[PDB]
């Protein structure tokens, strides 16, 4: 296991434009040369190549509109929900319970969650989404905890990105910075999410 | 640790002892020992095998009786998450050529997941991880679809004290007879050692 597949080299960074040294190959787009050491992320990346079997010319040829530096992320059609065998999505709205927890690589101003601890491969996302932005949120991960009851299509996640995806997304209505603010999510820090119990579920009632 | 520090002394208080391979020798509390090598390993970091409850807690929620004749009761709608008018969220979906699936179970049921989804994500009692056959430790199989097929697609309800939340696949046909003919292989465990097995080459980009 590395970073570029044996066949990329000697010259896995050929076709790429070079912009700032903390990249893979200096391209933003291609995430970060360091990736998380310590529980979960090391767990959650655990099964993640970053390009597949592809180099990172071919990675950006095939899943953004340039590989030169202007070129941009293509994301996959209805909201990325797996798709029947009607090319309808699959998702229904559901009332997402008190207690439940999320995570998320990516802004606050997003709108799609994961259940906390999906490997990464199930969430369908580029390498770009592990550049940290905020010193306080390493990766740009976020865990929060429902505080209050809301409703969210929630639905399984279609294959991107040379991943599989299948996990299950969440996508909002209201961004997750307003769902803070109104008191639907309470942010959780490390301490909260560090412990095995902490992953599973007491507030599903059982059938008895 | 087997269980919560809360349940010390006595945490096998009322089961009664069966076989000392399993938690307070009663199978349907799973193995003693867990797996130690990837990917099993991985797929139960996060697992805590009764939440925080005591193993007699555990049983009185999730089955019939503590009693050794209990057995454990499933959720409705073959455990597909339920919306907000009840109804389970599901879709028939064409698994393609290539992807890659495992279960915790024998071959002659029906519920597949991706490849690598944690333990928690799948909503199984414990005793989905006791082995059966030696060739299987942990009854755990991986297949690869080798000729594409229907199958019900959706997200897994949470269920015993876990979150679920992976995507299951219900088939239509049991595990053993899409091997026989010809839809699945089943895969040696150098098949999916690597991070780069985990990856997705079948799914195509975007048209540009
Ligand atoms: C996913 O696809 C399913 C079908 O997939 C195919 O079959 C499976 C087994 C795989 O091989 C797969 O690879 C194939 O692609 C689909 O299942 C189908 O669902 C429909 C709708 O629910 C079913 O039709 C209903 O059948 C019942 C039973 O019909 C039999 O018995 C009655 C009573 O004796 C006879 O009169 C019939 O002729 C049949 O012999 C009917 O009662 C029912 O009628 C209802 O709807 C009609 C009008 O639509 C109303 O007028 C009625 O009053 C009823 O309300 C439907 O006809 C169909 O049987 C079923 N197929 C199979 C093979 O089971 C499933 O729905 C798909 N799921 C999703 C989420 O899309
Ligand atoms: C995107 O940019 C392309 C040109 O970029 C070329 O290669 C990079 C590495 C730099 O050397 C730059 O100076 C070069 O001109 C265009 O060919 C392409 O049309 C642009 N995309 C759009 C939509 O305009
Ligand atoms: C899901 O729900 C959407 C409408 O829900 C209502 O409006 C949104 C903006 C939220 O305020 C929500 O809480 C409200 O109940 C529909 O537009 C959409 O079609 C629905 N999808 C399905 C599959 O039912
Ligand atoms: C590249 O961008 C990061 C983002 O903060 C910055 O820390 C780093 O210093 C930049 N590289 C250089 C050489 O300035
Ligand atoms: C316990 O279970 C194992 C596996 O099913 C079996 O081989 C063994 O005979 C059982 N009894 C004892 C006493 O180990
Ligand atoms: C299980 O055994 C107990 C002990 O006799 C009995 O009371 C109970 O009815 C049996 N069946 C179930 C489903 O609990
Ligand atoms: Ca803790
Ligand atoms: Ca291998």
């Given at each position: 296991?590395?970073?570029?597949?044996?066949?990329?080299?000697?010259?896995?960074?050929?076709g790429?434009?070079?912009?700032?040294?903390?990249?893979?190959?200096?391209?933003?787009?291609?995430?970060?040369?360091?990736?998380?050491?310590?529980?979960?992320?090391?767990?959650?990346?655990?099964?993640?190549?970053?390009?597949?079997?592809?180099?990172?010319?071919?990675?950006l040829?095939?899943?953004?509109?340039?590989?030169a530096?202007?070129?941009?992320?293509?994301?996959?059609?209805?909201?990325g929900?797996?798709?029947?065998?009607?090319?309808?999505?699959?998702?229904?709205?559901?009332?997402?319970?008190?207690?439940?927890?999320?995570?998320?690589?990516?802004?606050?101003?997003?709108?799609?969650?994961?259940?906390?601890?999906?490997?990464y491969?199930?969430?369908?996302?580029?390498?770009?989404?592990l550049?940290?932005?905020?010193g306080?949120?390493?990766?740009?991960?976020?865990?929060?905890?429902?505080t209050?009851?809301?409703?969210?299509?929630?639905?399984?996640?279609?294959?991107?990105?040379?991943?599989?995806?299948?996990?299950?997304?969440?996508?909002?209505?209201?961004?997750?910075?307003?769902?803070?603010?109104?008191?639907?999510?309470?942010?959780?820090?490390?301490?909260?999410?560090?412990?095995?119990?902490?992953?599973?579920?007491?507030?599903?009632?059982?059938?008895?």
């Open positions: 296991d590395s970073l570029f597949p044996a066949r990329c080299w000697p010259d896995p960074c050929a790429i434009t070079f912009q700032n040294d903390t990249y893979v190959c200096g391209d933003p787009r291609l995430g970060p040369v360091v990736l998380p050491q310590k529980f979960p992320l090391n767990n959650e990346l655990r099964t993640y190549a970053r390009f597949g079997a592809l180099c990172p010319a071919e990675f040829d095939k899943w953004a509109t340039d590989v530096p202007n070129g941009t992320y293509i994301y996959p059609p209805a909201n929900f797996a798709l029947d065998t009607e090319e309808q999505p699959i998702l229904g709205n559901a009332t997402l319970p008190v207690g439940m927890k999320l995570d998320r690589f990516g802004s606050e101003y997003g709108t799609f969650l994961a259940p906390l601890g999906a490997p491969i199930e969430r369908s996302l580029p390498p770009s989404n550049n940290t932005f905020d306080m949120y390493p990766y740009n991960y976020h865990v929060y905890q429902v209050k009851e809301f409703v969210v299509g929630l639905g399984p996640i279609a294959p991107w990105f040379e991943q599989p995806g299948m996990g299950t997304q969440f996508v909002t209505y209201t961004n997750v910075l307003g769902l803070i603010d109104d008191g639907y999510l309470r942010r959780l820090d490390e301490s909260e999410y560090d412990e095995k119990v902490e992953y599973s579920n007491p507030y599903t009632p059982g059938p008895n």
